[PDB]
Amino acid sequence: ATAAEIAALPRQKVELVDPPFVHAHSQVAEGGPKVVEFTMVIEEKKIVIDDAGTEVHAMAFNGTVPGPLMVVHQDDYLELTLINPETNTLMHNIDFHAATGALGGGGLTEINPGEKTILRFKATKPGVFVYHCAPPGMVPWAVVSGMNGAIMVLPREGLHDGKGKALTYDKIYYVGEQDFYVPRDENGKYKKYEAPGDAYEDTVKVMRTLTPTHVVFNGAVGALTGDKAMTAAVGEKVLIVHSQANRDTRPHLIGGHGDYVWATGKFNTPPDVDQETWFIPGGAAGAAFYTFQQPGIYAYVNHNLIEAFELGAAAHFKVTGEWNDDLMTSVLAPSG
Amino acid sequence: ATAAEIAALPRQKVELVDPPFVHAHSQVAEGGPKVVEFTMVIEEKKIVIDDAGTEVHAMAFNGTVPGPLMVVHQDDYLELTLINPETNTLMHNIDFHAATGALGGGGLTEINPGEKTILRFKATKPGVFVYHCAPPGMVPWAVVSGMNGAIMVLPREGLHDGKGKALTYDKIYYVGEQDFYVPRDENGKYKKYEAPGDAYEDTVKVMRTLTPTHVVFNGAVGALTGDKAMTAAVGEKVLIVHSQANRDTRPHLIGGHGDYVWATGKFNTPPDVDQETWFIPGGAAGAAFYTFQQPGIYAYVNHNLIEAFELGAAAHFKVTGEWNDDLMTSVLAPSG
Amino acid sequence: ATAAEIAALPRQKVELVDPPFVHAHSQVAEGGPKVVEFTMVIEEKKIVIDDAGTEVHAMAFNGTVPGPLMVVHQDDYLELTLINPETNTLMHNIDFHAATGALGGGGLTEINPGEKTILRFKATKPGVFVYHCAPPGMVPWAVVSGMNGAIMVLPREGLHDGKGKALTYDKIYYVGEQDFYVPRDENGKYKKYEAPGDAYEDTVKVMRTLTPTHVVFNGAVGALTGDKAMTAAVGEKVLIVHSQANRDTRPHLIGGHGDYVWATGKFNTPPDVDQETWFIPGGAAGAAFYTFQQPGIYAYVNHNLIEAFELGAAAHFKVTGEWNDDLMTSVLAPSGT
Ligand SMILES: [Cu+2]
Ligand SMILES: [Cu+2]
Ligand SMILES: [Cu+2]
Ligand SMILES: [Cu+]
Ligand SMILES: [Cu+]
Ligand SMILES: [Cu+]
């Protein structure tokens, strides 16, 4: 569009919500292209990531791991105000895999503590995409300290299957998956550090083994289980967006399926169907659409079951409604 | 269908055979929906997995690693009688990735030793699917002790390519790939245990490294070589089902291809074609269709070659027939 | 085709070029099927794989890691003269994933030092495909010693997207990604060896961890950076062929995309589109097509960022041209709150 045309576009401020929840949005675009405005403040803070009091100096967009899901439509502009308070100790920036140019925005958004920046980019490609911090010389460390999230760029006409039939979800959740690499002393106990930089050398040593100590959803072991399970009802259509900025994952809904799965996360690539377990390579986001058919507790996992059940990569859905004996029935219950 | 309608459907009792062979079945569905009945006894047994006499306490559906392939058609009912003998020591159950509800059947099939159960589920989705044991609190341990297999849910009109052209195999083989995590002593010799539970704590430590000590086909190094090499002839169309319940794999037929590969394992997702090496994520099954064109020895491997030739993920095919010099000829044999 | 019909086919002798460059070729086939002839000499040679001076005894097709990209069209015959000079100490062979029979040619190309062989195969399927050495009993050691490359079998009508539209690249690069497993001493410093065989047992131990010490493009940390950076211009269409003969990778162009990606490497399988990060399993090649829209530096990486930035799997593109503020603009440059 021409300079005047871009300047004339409506500007809309959106308030973000913490994962796994997603801010208000419409699936079908309302009106023509807009400049959708978001603000995130960066927080450096100690978080506890397991039941044994294990700490990480997190680097968190909007104070959360993962950072929040930002939702726009194709050919909207995403305009992010990014703030790095003077209480932080590191330079931070942002790389949007959805964006084109300047290392995804990373080269234009390098902000020291006490600085802010505003980046605008045109969301030319429909899909879910990773975003992450990427300070030159320390890229992986920032990313595995939790400084990553995702955005969704919806097609202007909403989602469709491979045959052009509309796929309209009733709810959407965003599951960000994080590999953490926590140093341990020679006794096997996880170390703690006073300042974020103090952990740098010990952490990189663990990173180089390529073996995470923890693999978690929403920033901690059990963050999406128990009373923090995600919810649905029988007949409800659910979109599950899943990201991993650094390492491969293989999501699986135990008791369910991915009816339609954009495994690559890109909406112009037709979705796979009837999936048992899908695969999202490190550095990407994917999305799965499922209509729930049975009530009960489901587990949603990375189906390397060691990562799921030993390292933390397991969430739950609690689903209300009536049981379908046609789909499944216990013909003879466990008996002597 | 109503319970009454289901009750009135034909029953067919199937007799299972040990992998890599697959029980007698039709590719095209013979008549309307049936209730297909299978029975499996759970055998906790010691298996030797390598030529060094390394032992695993296996947890084995039908006495094998992997468990046998069950074949039904879409919208059939799979009715499994699962038996846990008094000669066992652990609670076992079954999760069918093909099933909808109750953790794939796992919540409804928990049998203590001396108990049995009968689960029925509607096979609504066509494809190959993993099944595995999943006892709450010990899911990865059960799975990496060999308690997994796969089923095939065929389309009622049999297999087709991406454009609806029919694909009929002459032979079918089921390769179950297994990652084992065997503890070692301080000299690097593998440990032996006199009861399954004795290995638990040691085994969990190895599992947490995410690095298998062995990666094997059909339960042991060299299992599908020599007396167990798969066979075919030039001109023959072969389907190779491959599962991995816990860890990624990348099958490759050395000297051949995957002419058609349902890499995600799901038949409503069009297959990839002309594949050199395909990818199956942990927690999934896939299938490749190939027409042999050359005689001789072929190796079928996980194409991480360290996994194939150091850790044990290699099978052979012995193929009879006439050499084709158009496809390949030695113009000058190795010479000075 | 009969031996007589194949004898009647034209011959074309191709001079190979070193990666990441690709020898002259035509996207759309010129004429009917031909016998396309290549020669490679295998070199066992010491190579340096990082800025610290870490050495590997490499086993190298045409003297480079990766070996060079051979380009033919579907239904051409690729005829390779492979030479194992007497200065080498191991038997070598070649397995073409593109080929059908005799373990991809491995069974028919086993040459001791001082020997040569000529193999011909019909390139029946279009795509990019790995080739690698595979001597029985030492297969992964040969491969992770650098003895692998790729070929491209173009469709006779060139590349097209999943819907019949012609895709014509302006330039092509071949990025071979290599996992190395280098033994360390008790200091944690990389060990050097007098002869290739001296390193075997220590190397196999590292290999068994399934954890490479180095993951590199074009044979070394930073090999495709500085004056060796790949180049493009705004508006230019680039095909990037990427191979990994042993271990998975997840390519990503930082600041760009894969507009069309044959993630499986096979051209009869329709490409994925608008990709951020694609996935190529160990034992395969893939190809990505992109039209550059913005000038400046880009990094092309394996998006396990530890692999990219700690272990060496990062290359650079330098792109010339005019910046597009519609696509991206700094509304407010970094400035005090
Ligand atoms: Cu990135
Ligand atoms: Cu499962
Ligand atoms: Cu190979
Ligand atoms: Cu940061
Ligand atoms: Cu079990
Ligand atoms: Cu070799």
Cβ atoms of residues C280 and C155 within 8 Å: no
Cβ atoms of residues A34 and A77 within 8 Å: yes
B330 to C117: CB separation less than 8 angstroms, yes or no:
yes
Q: Which residues 93-132 of chain A have a CB within 8 Å of chain C?
A: 95, 97-112, 114-122, 124-127, 129-130
Query: Whose structure tokens read 């920032």?
Result: A142
**How far is it, in rounded angstroms, from Cα A269 to Cα A317?**
28
Q: Are residues C123 and C167 in the same domain?
A: no
- Any residues with CB less than 8 A from the CB of A189 and at least 6 apart, and which? none
Q: What are the strands of the beta sheet with B148-154, ordered from one edge?
A: B70-73, B148-154, B127-132, B95-96
Q: What are the strands of the beta sheet with B251-254, ordered from one edge?
A: B230-233, B314-320, B296-302, B251-254
A210 to C255: CB separation less than 8 angstroms, yes or no:
no
- Any residues with CB less than 8 A from the CB of A66 and at least 6 apart, and which? A19, A146, A148, A149, A150, A174, A176, A178, A218, A219, A243
Please list the alpha-helical segments (H only) found in chain A. 3-8, 139-144, 200-208, 305-309
Of B120, B126, B268, Cβ closest to residue A329: B120
Shortest distance, CA B27 to any CA of chain C (angstroms): 25
Question: Exposed, middle or buried by CB within 10 Å (0-12, 13-18, 19+), for A260?
Answer: buried
- Number of continuous H segments (helices) and E segments (strands) in chain C: 4, 20
**How far is it, in rounded angstroms, from Cα C22 to Cα B22?**
46
Helix/strand/coil (H, E, C) string of B146-205?
Answer: CCEEEEEEECCCCCECCCCCECCCCEEEEEEEEEECCCECCCCCECCCCCHHHHHHHHHH
Shortest distance, CA A14 to any CA of chain C (angstroms): 18
Q: Are residues A192 and A149 in the same domain?
A: no
Q: Are residues C29 and C167 in the same domain?
A: no
Cβ atoms of residues B242 and B282 within 8 Å: no
Structure tokens at B204: 């969990």
Cβ atoms of residues A56 and A202 within 8 Å: no
**How far is it, in rounded angstroms, from Cα B324 to Cα B291?**
14
- Which chain B residues have a beta carbon less than 8 Å from that of A315? none
- Any residues with CB less than 8 A from the CB of A222 and at least 6 apart, and which? A51, A228, A312, A314
Identify the three-state secondary structure at position C82: strand
The Cβ of residue B127 has, within 10 Å, a number of other Cβ atoms equal to 28
**How far is it, in rounded angstroms, from Cα B138 to Cα B143?**
9
Q: Are residues B15 and B151 in the same domain?
A: yes
R_g (Cα) of chain A, nearest Å: 20
Q: Are residues A29 and A170 in the same domain?
A: no
Q: Which of C155, C179, C212 is the last residue of a domain?
A: C155
Of A252, A304, A333, Cβ closest to residue B247: A304
- The amino acid at residue B144 is V
| Mode of pairing for the β-strands spanning C148-154 and C35-48 | unpaired
DSSP string of C241-279, one letter each residue: EEEESSS-B-EEEET--EEEEETTSBTTSPPEEEESB--
Q: Which of B116, B133, B155 is the last residue of a domain?
A: B155
Q: Which residues 242-271 of chain B have a CB within 8 Å of chain A?
A: 245-248, 264-266, 268-269
- Which of A84, A92, A48 is closest to A180 using CA atoms? A48
Backbone angles phi, psi at C200, to 5 degrees: -55, -60
**How far is it, in rounded angstroms, from Cα C117 to Cα A322?**
70
Q: Are residues A124 and A172 in the same domain?
A: no
DSSP string of C133-168, one letter each residue: ---TT-HHHHHTTT-EEEEEEE-TB--B-TTS-B--
- Which chain B residues have a beta carbon less than 8 Å from that of A211? 209-211
Size of interface A-B (CB pairs under 8 A): 167
Query: Whose structure tokens read 């490409």?
Result: C271
Cβ atoms of residues A214 and A311 within 8 Å: yes
The Cβ of residue A96 has, within 10 Å, a number of other Cβ atoms equal to 27
Interchain CB contact of A288 with C (< 8 Å): no
A119 to C303: CB separation less than 8 angstroms, yes or no:
no
**How far is it, in rounded angstroms, from Cα A270 to Cα A31?**
26
**How far is it, in rounded angstroms, from Cα B93 to Cα C248?**
33
Residue C328 forms part of a structural domain:
no
How far, in Å, are B5, B10, B134 from residue B31 at the CA level?
Answer: 16, 10, 34
Nearest CA in chain B to A318: B102
Question: Exposed, middle or buried by CB within 10 Å (0-12, 13-18, 19+), for B335?
Answer: exposed
- Which of B265, B326, B31, B331 is closest to B128 using CA atoms? B265
User: What residue numbers bound the domain in which A315 lies?
Assistant: 156-322
Terminal alpha carbon distance of chain C: 75
- Which of C235, C270, C265, C241 is closest to C161 using CA atoms? C270
- Any residues with CB less than 8 A from the CB of A264 and at least 6 apart, and which? A127, A284, A286, C263, C272, C275, C278
Identify the three-state secondary structure at position A5: helix
Backbone angles phi, psi at B198, to 5 degrees: -65, -25
Q: Are residues B36 and B73 in the same domain?
A: yes
**How far is it, in rounded angstroms, from Cα A103 to Cα A223?**
32
CA triplet A294, A299, A300: central angle to 5 degrees?
Answer: 105
Identify the three-state secondary structure at position A93: coil
Q: Which residues 56-95 of chain C have a CB within 8 Å of chain B?
A: 79, 81, 95
Q: Are residues A184 and A310 in the same domain?
A: yes
Q: Which of B108, B135, B155 is the last residue of a domain?
A: B155
**How far is it, in rounded angstroms, from Cα B296 to Cα B288?**
20
Cβ atoms of residues C315 and C175 within 8 Å: yes
- The amino acid at residue C15 is E
Nearest CA in chain A to B115: A336
| Mode of pairing for the β-strands spanning C230-233 and C214-217 | unpaired
**How far is it, in rounded angstroms, from Cα A198 to Cα A188?**
19
Cβ atoms of residues C253 and A100 within 8 Å: no
Q: Are residues B79 and B226 in the same domain?
A: no
Burial B76-105 (b: 16+ CB within 10 A, else e): bbbbbebbbeeebebbbbbbbbbbbbbbbb
**How far is it, in rounded angstroms, from Cα B144 to Cα B129?**
17
Cβ atoms of residues B218 and B21 within 8 Å: no
R_g (Cα) of chain C, nearest Å: 21
Shortest distance, CA C317 to any CA of chain A (angstroms): 11
**How far is it, in rounded angstroms, from Cα B326 to Cα C76?**
11
- Which chain C residues have a beta carbon less than 8 Å from that of A125? 257, 274
Query: Which chains contact C through at least 3 pairs of Cβ atoms less than 8 Å apart?
Result: A, B
Identify the three-state secondary structure at position A61: strand
A327 to B124: CB separation less than 8 angstroms, yes or no:
yes
CA triplet A80, A81, A82: central angle to 5 degrees?
Answer: 105
Q: Which residues 162-221 of chain B have a CB within 8 Å of chain C?
A: 211
DSSP string of B205-251, one letter each residue: HHHTTT--SEEEETTBTTTTSGGG-EEEETT-EEEEEEEESSS-B-E
Identify the three-state secondary structure at position C198: helix
Shortest distance, CA B77 to any CA of chain A (angstroms): 9
Burial B291-325 (b: 16+ CB within 10 A, else e): bbbbbbebbbbbbbbbbbbbbbbbbbbebeeeeee
**How far is it, in rounded angstroms, from Cα B70 to Cα A103?**
50
- Any residues with CB less than 8 A from the CB of A137 and at least 6 apart, and which? none
DSSP string of C11-57, one letter each residue: EEE-----TTS-----SB--SS--EEEEEEEEEEEEEE-STT--EEE
Cβ atoms of residues B70 and B78 within 8 Å: yes
Cβ atoms of residues B28 and B74 within 8 Å: no
Residue C242 forms part of a structural domain:
yes
Q: Where are the beta strands (DSSP E) in A169-267?
A: 171-180, 214-217, 230-233, 237-244, 251-254, 258-262
C274 to A102: CB separation less than 8 angstroms, yes or no:
no
The number of folded domains in chain B is 2
Q: Ligand 4 centroid vs C221 CA: distance in angstroms?
A: 25
Q: What is the resolution of this structure in A?
A: 1.8
Residue C329 forms part of a structural domain:
no
Structure tokens at B301: 């491997």
- The amino acid at residue C319 is V
Cβ atoms of residues A310 and B140 within 8 Å: yes
Q: Could you tell me the sign of the dihedral formed by the alpha carbons of A58, A263, B149, C245, in that order?
A: negative
**How far is it, in rounded angstroms, from Cα B256 to Cα B236?**
13
Residue A327 forms part of a structural domain:
no
- The amino acid at residue B30 is E
- Can you say whether residue C114 is alpha, beta or left, with left for phi > 0 and alpha for psi between -120 and 50 degrees? left
- Which of A27, A324, C77, A305 is closest to B142 using CA atoms? A305
Interchain CB contact of B328 with C (< 8 Å): yes
Cβ atoms of residues C112 and B336 within 8 Å: no
Method underlying the structure: X-ray
Cβ atoms of residues A61 and A54 within 8 Å: no
- The amino acid at residue C83 is I
Residue A330 forms part of a structural domain:
no
**How far is it, in rounded angstroms, from Cα B44 to Cα B86?**
11
Q: Are residues B128 and B183 in the same domain?
A: no
Nearest CA in chain B to A215: B208
H or E segment and range at residue A316: strand A314-320
CA triplet C237, A284, A241: central angle to 5 degrees?
Answer: 130
**How far is it, in rounded angstroms, from Cα B221 to Cα C247?**
21
Nearest CA in chain A to B246: A304
Residue C330 forms part of a structural domain:
no
Size of interface A-C (CB pairs under 8 A): 171
Q: Are residues A148 and A163 in the same domain?
A: no
**How far is it, in rounded angstroms, from Cα C95 to Cα C189?**
34
C274 to A127: CB separation less than 8 angstroms, yes or no:
yes
H or E segment and range at residue B6: helix B3-7
Backbone angles phi, psi at C196, to 5 degrees: -50, -45
- Which chain C residues have a beta carbon less than 8 Å from that of B310? 140, 204, 207-208
**How far is it, in rounded angstroms, from Cα A258 to Cα B174?**
24
Question: Exposed, middle or buried by CB within 10 Å (0-12, 13-18, 19+), for C336?
Answer: exposed
The Cβ of residue C53 has, within 10 Å, a number of other Cβ atoms equal to 9
Size of interface B-C (CB pairs under 8 A): 167
Nearest CA in chain C to A83: C337
Cβ atoms of residues B302 and B329 within 8 Å: no
Identify the three-state secondary structure at position A242: strand
Residue A189 forms part of a structural domain:
yes
Q: Give the CATH number, domain containing residue A173.
A: 2.60.40.420
The Cβ of residue B15 has, within 10 Å, a number of other Cβ atoms equal to 9
- Which of C241, C275, C254 is closest to C317 using CA atoms? C254
- Can you say whether residue A217 is alpha, beta or left, with left for phi > 0 and alpha for psi between -120 and 50 degrees? beta
Residue A84 forms part of a structural domain:
yes
B257 to C210: CB separation less than 8 angstroms, yes or no:
no
Identify the three-state secondary structure at position B134: coil
- Number of continuous H segments (helices) and E segments (strands) in chain B: 4, 20
CA atoms within 13 A on the CB side of A287: 33
| Mode of pairing for the β-strands spanning C314-320 and C296-302 | antiparallel
Query: Whose structure tokens read 């055979």?
Result: B17
How far, in Å, are A141, B281, C6, C209 from residue C76 at the CA level?
Answer: 48, 35, 10, 41
Q: Are residues B150 and B162 in the same domain?
A: no
